[PDB]
Amino acid sequence: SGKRYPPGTSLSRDCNTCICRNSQWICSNEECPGECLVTGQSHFKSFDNRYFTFSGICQYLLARDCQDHSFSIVIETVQCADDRDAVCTRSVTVRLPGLHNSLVKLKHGAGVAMDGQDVQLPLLKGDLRIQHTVTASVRLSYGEDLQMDWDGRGRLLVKLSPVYAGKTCGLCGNYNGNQGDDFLTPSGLAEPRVEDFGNAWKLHGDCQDLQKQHSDPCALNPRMTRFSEEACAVLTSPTFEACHRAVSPLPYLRNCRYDVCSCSDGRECLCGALASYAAACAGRGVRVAWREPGRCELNCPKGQVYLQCGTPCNLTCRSLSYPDEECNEACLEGCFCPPGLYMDERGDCVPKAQCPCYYDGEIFQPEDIFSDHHTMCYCEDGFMHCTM
Amino acid sequence: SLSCRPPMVKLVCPADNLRAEGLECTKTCQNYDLECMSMGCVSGCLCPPGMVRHENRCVALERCPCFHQGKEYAPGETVKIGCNTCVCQDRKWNCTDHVCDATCSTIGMAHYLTFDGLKYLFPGECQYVLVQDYCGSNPGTFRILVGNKGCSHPSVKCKKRVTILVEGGEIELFDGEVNVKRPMKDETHFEVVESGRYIILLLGKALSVVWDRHLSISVVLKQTYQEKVCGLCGNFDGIQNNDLTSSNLQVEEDPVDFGNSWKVSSQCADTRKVPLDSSPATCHNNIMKQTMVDSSCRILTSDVFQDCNKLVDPEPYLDVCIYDTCSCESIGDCACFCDTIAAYAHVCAQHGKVVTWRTATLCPQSCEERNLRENGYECEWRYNSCAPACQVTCQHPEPLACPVQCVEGCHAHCPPGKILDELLQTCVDPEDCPVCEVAGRRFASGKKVTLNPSDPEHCQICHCDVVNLTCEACQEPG
Amino acid sequence: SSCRILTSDVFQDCNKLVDPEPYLDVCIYDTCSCESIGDCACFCDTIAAYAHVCAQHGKVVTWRTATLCPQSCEERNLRENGYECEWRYNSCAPACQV
Amino acid sequence: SSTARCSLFGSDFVNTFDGSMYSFAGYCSYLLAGGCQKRSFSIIGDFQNGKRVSLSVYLGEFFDIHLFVNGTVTQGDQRVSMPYASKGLYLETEAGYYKLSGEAYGFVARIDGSGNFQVLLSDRYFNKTCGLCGNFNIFAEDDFMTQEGTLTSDPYDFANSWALSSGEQWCERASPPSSSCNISSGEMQKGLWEQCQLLKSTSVFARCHPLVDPEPFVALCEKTLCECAGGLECACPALLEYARTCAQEGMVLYGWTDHSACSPVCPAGMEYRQCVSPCARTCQSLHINEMCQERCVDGCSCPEGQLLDEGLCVESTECPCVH
Ligand SMILES: *[C@@H]1O[C@H](CO)[C@@H](O)[C@H](O)[C@H]1NC(C)=O
Ligand SMILES: *[C@@H]1O[C@H](CO)[C@@H](O)[C@H](O)[C@H]1NC(C)=O
Ligand SMILES: *[C@@H]1O[C@H](CO)[C@@H](O)[C@H](O)[C@H]1NC(C)=O
Ligand SMILES: *[C@@H]1O[C@H](CO)[C@@H](O)[C@H](O)[C@H]1NC(C)=O
Ligand SMILES: *[C@@H]1O[C@H](CO)[C@@H](O)[C@H](O)[C@H]1NC(C)=O
Ligand SMILES: [Ca+2]
Ligand SMILES: [Ca+2]
Ligand SMILES: [Ca+2]
Numbered sequence A: 001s002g003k004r005y006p007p008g009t010s011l012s013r014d015c016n017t018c019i020c021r022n023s024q025w026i027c028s029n030e031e032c033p034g035e036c037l038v039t040g041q042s043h044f045k046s047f048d049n050r051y052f053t054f055s056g057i058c059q060y061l062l063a064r065d066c067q068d069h070s071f072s073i074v075i076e077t078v079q080c081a082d083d084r085d086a087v088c089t090r091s092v093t094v095r096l097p098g099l100h101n102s103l104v105k106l107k108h109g110a111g112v113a114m115d116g117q118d119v120q121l122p123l124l125k126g127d128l129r130i131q132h133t134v135t136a137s138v139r140l141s142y143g144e145d146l147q148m149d150w151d152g153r154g155r156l157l158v159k160l161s162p163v164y165a166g167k168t169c170g171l172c173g174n175y176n177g178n179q180g181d182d183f184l185t186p187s188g189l190a191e192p193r194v195e196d197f198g199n200a201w202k203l204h205g206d207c208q209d210l211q212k213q214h215s216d217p218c219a220l221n222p223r224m225t226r227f228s229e230e231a232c233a234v235l236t237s238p239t240f241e242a243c244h245r246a247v248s249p250l251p252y253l254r255n256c257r258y259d260v261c262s263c264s265d266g267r268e269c270l271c272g273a274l275a276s277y278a279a280a281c282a283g284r285g286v287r288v289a290w291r292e293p294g295r296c297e298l299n300c301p302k303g304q305v306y307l308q309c310g311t312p313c314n315l316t317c318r319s320l321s322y323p324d325e326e327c328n329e330a331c332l333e334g335c336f337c338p339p340g341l342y343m344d345e346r347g348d349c350v351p352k353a354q355c356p357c358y359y360d361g362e363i364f365q366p367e368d369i370f371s372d373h374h375t376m377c378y379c380e381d382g383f384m385h386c387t388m
Numbered sequence B: 001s002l003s004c005r006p007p008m009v010k011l012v013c014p015a016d017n018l019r020a021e022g023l024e025c026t027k028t029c030q031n032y033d034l035e036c037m038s039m040g041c042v043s044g045c046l047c048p049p050g051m052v053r054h055e056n057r058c059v060a061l062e063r064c065p066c067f068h069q070g071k072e073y074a075p076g077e078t079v080k081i082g083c084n085t086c087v088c089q090d091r092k093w094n095c096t097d098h099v100c101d102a103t104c105s106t107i108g109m110a111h112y113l114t115f116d117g118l119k120y121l122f123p124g125e126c127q128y129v130l131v132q133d134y135c136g137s138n139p140g141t142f143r144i145l146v147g148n149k150g151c152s153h154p155s156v157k158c159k160k161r162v163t164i165l166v167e168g169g170e171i172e173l174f175d176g177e178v179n180v181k182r183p184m185k186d187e188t189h190f191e192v193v194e195s196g197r198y199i200i201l202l203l204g205k206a207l208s209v210v211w212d213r214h215l216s217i218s219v220v221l222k223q224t225y226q227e228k229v230c231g232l233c234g235n236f237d238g239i240q241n242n243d244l245t246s247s248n249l250q251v252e253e254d255p256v257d258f259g260n261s262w263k264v265s266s267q268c269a270d271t272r273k274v275p276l277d278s279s280p281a282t283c284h285n286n287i288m289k290q291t292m293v294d295s296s297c298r299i300l301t302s303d304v305f306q307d308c309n310k311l312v313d314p315e316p317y318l319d320v321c322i323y324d325t326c327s328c329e330s331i332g333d334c335a336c337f338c339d340t341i342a343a344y345a346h347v348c349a350q351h352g353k354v355v356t357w358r359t360a361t362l363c364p365q366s367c368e369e370r371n372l373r374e375n376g377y378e379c380e381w382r383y384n385s386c387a388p389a390c391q392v393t394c395q396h397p398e399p400l401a402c403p404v405q406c407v408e409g410c411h412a413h414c415p416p417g418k419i420l421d422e423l424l425q426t427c428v429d430p431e432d433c434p435v436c437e438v439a440g441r442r443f444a445s446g447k448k449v450t451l452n453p454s455d456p457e458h459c460q461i462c463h464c465d466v467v468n469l470t471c472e473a474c475q476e477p478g
Numbered sequence C: 001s002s003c004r005i006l007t008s009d010v011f012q013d014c015n016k017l018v019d020p021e022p023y024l025d026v027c028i029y030d031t032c033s034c035e036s037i038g039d040c041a042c043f044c045d046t047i048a049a050y051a052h053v054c055a056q057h058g059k060v061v062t063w064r065t066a067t068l069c070p071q072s073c074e075e076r077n078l079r080e081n082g083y084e085c086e087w088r089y090n091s092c093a094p095a096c097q098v
Numbered sequence D: 001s002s003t004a005r006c007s008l009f010g011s012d013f014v015n016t017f018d019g020s021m022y023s024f025a026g027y028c029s030y031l032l033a034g035g036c037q038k039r040s041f042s043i044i045g046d047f048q049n050g051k052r053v054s055l056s057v058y059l060g061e062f063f064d065i066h067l068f069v070n071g072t073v074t075q076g077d078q079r080v081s082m083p084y085a086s087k088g089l090y091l092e093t094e095a096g097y098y099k100l101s102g103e104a105y106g107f108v109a110r111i112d113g114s115g116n117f118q119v120l121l122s123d124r125y126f127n128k129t130c131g132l133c134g135n136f137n138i139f140a141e142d143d144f145m146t147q148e149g150t151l152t153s154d155p156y157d158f159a160n161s162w163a164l165s166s167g168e169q170w171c172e173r174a175s176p177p178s179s180s181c182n183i184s185s186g187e188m189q190k191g192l193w194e195q196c197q198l199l200k201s202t203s204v205f206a207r208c209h210p211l212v213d214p215e216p217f218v219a220l221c222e223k224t225l226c227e228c229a230g231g232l233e234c235a236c237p238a239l240l241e242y243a244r245t246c247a248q249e250g251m252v253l254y255g256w257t258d259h260s261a262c263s264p265v266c267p268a269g270m271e272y273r274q275c276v277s278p279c280a281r282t283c284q285s286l287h288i289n290e291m292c293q294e295r296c297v298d299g300c301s302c303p304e305g306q307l308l309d310e311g312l313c314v315e316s317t318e319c320p321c322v323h
């Protein structure tokens, strides 16, 4: 990347490692998980690191296990502004044949609905765990080979481990490492026109298929043409200097100008798109401090404080109830409050004195003496001390 | 109410089965293999299980067509994509497995299309390894190179130089013509076809080069290699996202660092990481001009290209159009715009889509001067959309391995009974060709090759310069 | 340099008769202002203007090549499917014929 | 015909190309007209708060003009003088009223002294445009086909579909105004019903009926004769439109303002004529003729002599020289 390294060093990509020996990096080829991403209005990413857009409004098949049928994902897409070139996600449906042949639905809130039933988070069933992440974003976790991300305002993500190498089919491609084959219709042939690909994965015949995927919605709103330039001009500004050599910014810039001219309010459409790039930079190692009072710093409530890179392990009051559980989480970004304070259910965070206990789930007040004939139990400080 | 048609029967949601997949999961031919959601059915009238809906018609059999490009195909109908046929037997397309012949390209001044297909930007000024065979653990037969000068910014400058190193030879080209600095050993495979606007140039069984006389470099490799090469065109493996494997054997994300790994002179000036923007230098803060250039590149999406747009994405080729001609000033000969279109038009021709997009008020391309040397204008040289490249001549009477179907340019058209020779510009009767047929068999017009090296006792050599029915004596080793 | 065709080997006859200096000033002025993206007539025309003035003083000139302002004439003889090719750009041809 | 006509007359009132009026008190810019498949241009009208300020033409991507109530004009943000002719758009004054002509692009816009946007548009755009002035079809009702394309019965949410925001301001849905007329009814409907009525009664208006219908015009006035306190003049805006709307059809009317007791505003030295030629023979003019075969346009102009010289009417004797 235009900088020198001594021999013997072992720099590491996110996927694997590489070592300098005789001016030649040696490298493994071992697989590593892929990600199909939805965001913006209609900007998609394949497993094989393709980018495109398909502003179709129907229940399309996002992804699916295709040699067996461990799961299947179905986006549902909607027009999302006065403009015709503004089609964002409403909801996504997930289907687990492995458990009940149930049907999970991710709702435009942070809400989820299983089989029509609204459900509290966490949702420990046998395999799938559904809990908030920052308390503003849902995360499904089926087994170990699957993740999801919040489909509230439509930023759906996935994590497919390499066990699914090449055996998926949908909008998101094969997950085979090949970026070129990705427009492969269900009838088994690569289509050069995106307008052919997405409409082949709708689930309803009544859905009109489109004919042209416009590139410049800014034409139909000439007012925003000026603004759309300077707005994501910061994307290439040296504010993001540290991860130009981590991921190609040029599409994320392209995906900005489609969104800001398209949506109703370009304020957040801008600042959701910039976070789109920062999230990818962070997913490779590089965090960026790109928030300002002008550049859309969120407003953590008075109980909370903004934080750049922190540990979502010791935050919730539940953690004191289940301390033994592992928290193999990253250094995440969001609204925390200082370490003396732990998060309470009511949006405030509190010291651990009045931090209730969640024994059997049951929300015991901080002082609850509590016992059968045979057991003997109390809630001290967030932990539930049982005996016999 | 309405009693639905006879060919199908009404359904009712049972009160027990949550799986009331009735009207909502109306299976058409598209969504049959696709799995559907359903809360409950409706009071609709759905086809029997043995059939589906088909455009307001419950087509009975599972014979309903196999779509491609949003178009019908009956079962049994075939489609030709690339060098493969492909039939839809039941409902999915069933294709062959003949991998086709890939093709590098230099569309404009500084852009590069890989074999597997990867446009990327790389303004360079040093000499670079376009493609070679000497890659890792191979013999290293051919070493096609490229060298540009004053070509970081596209303009009327940037005359390319190309030096191609095969069979221990040194033949190179620039400035309109080709030059042999060192002839190679096996002259038999050597071949040059100056036809139309191109210099078609074979070098062997599985190698061919094409040159537009101006900038473009379209080398064509056969099925032989299949990951035996590397350079700026990638590896030719089919994998499309591993074409940026630098010479130090690691994928790079930023192509400007990539091609720096492939420069020959390891001490010249490596290029500079440009800040990324949608506007080149001229179009930078020149929004007025920036629209006029934009509209002009929309010929790539015009009524005349509508056939080819469905096959080949114009979007890659558009990006080059806008990039070059902003940077280019296009004062005199405005080829820094005309060429980018011609590049797309030829790719269209390779897929069988000849196009006539060239008018008198846009990139005219006259052909009158060849019909000048004779005092009387016989008028045989006519410019033509895409006339075939591999014909027979006095110099090349035999048919040649023809990597390119047809090509643009001036093409001498005259009635039959006359074969073209380039020295005497017109076409001429066949007998006037200095053609050679020694001891009966049909071959070329006296190639300058010493046949029969293998057996000394059978060293029965017969050259032919132009016409002579001669045979030379072999010098004995003893 | 591009406008120095107006002072080139091919115009040496006409340079002695007609001053090219007025016509040069227009050349540089127009084509700077002009962007000359597609049909680059905002340069080709200024020269053609000078070449005709040269013709009026009896100095026919052939300055037009294939790599500079080509000016084909096939269309006609092309449309003439039966290519009896006749529409040959007769250089500076008598405008007033029968 | 071969032309169209939209009008934003008076306060909040609109006239589409096809005889469909309503009222709208917007809050920001709104697209008046332009292509819908592709836009070579676009006409937008900014509303401060219901009341209008600025007409503007965004010519594709690269050029813009903002002419506004006061009368001053800018290009981008740099205030330019007037007249002004860049990019094939001649920004001129006619009959004391400001004009923007886009004949290359097939439109003519203008404003009067009071502030009344008008758009004459070429028949090249039939069942083609779609904006706030409706489609240039024939149907004088379907002309509410939203930015998605939806026949909406409401004349209000429709206009709010064609909202365009900028970075300087992001605008919302305005609200329909709550009328104070509903309680302050009193005599104001009895004595003042007549000035709306005279569109029908008076003979000078009694002859465009086979061409147009005053019934919407009398309908749209009666709701706006109630907010203004103490004035018969409140009828003449809705009326003044009816004059032009008949005139555009090919049948002009004459001298109607003589007894109407309402003349449209114009600066000193001029008052409202009807059907003055656009080629006002001014002071510093060349005496050429029979090129100005243009159609005849209404507006205020000088007396019989009193040639124009820099926005005022001055006697022909005192024509200056210039150097
Ligand atoms: C493809 O066609 C061949 C030849 O008819 C047949 O043998 C094979 O089963 C087919 N395969 C598929 C996937 O349809
Ligand atoms: C031009 O060449 C094309 C392609 O070879 C051929 O189909 C066509 O007949 C030619 N036309 C003329 C006028 O020679
Ligand atoms: C026609 O053009 C030729 C070649 O330029 C020239 O020699 C000849 O004088 C011209 N004849 C006429 C009639 O203009
Ligand atoms: C009046 O003109 C001034 C100066 O050009 C401008 O700042 C202002 O916005 C105008 N106001 C109105 C109501 O047009
Ligand atoms: C109106 O335009 C639509 C869309 O172009 C077209 O389908 C229809 O025929 C047109 N109708 C009339 C009355 O012109
Ligand atoms: Ca794939
Ligand atoms: Ca490759
Ligand atoms: Ca003479």
Ligand SMILES: [Ca+2]
Pocket: D016, D017, D018, D134, D135, D136, D137, D138, D139, D140, D141, D142, D143
């Ligand atoms: Ca209408």
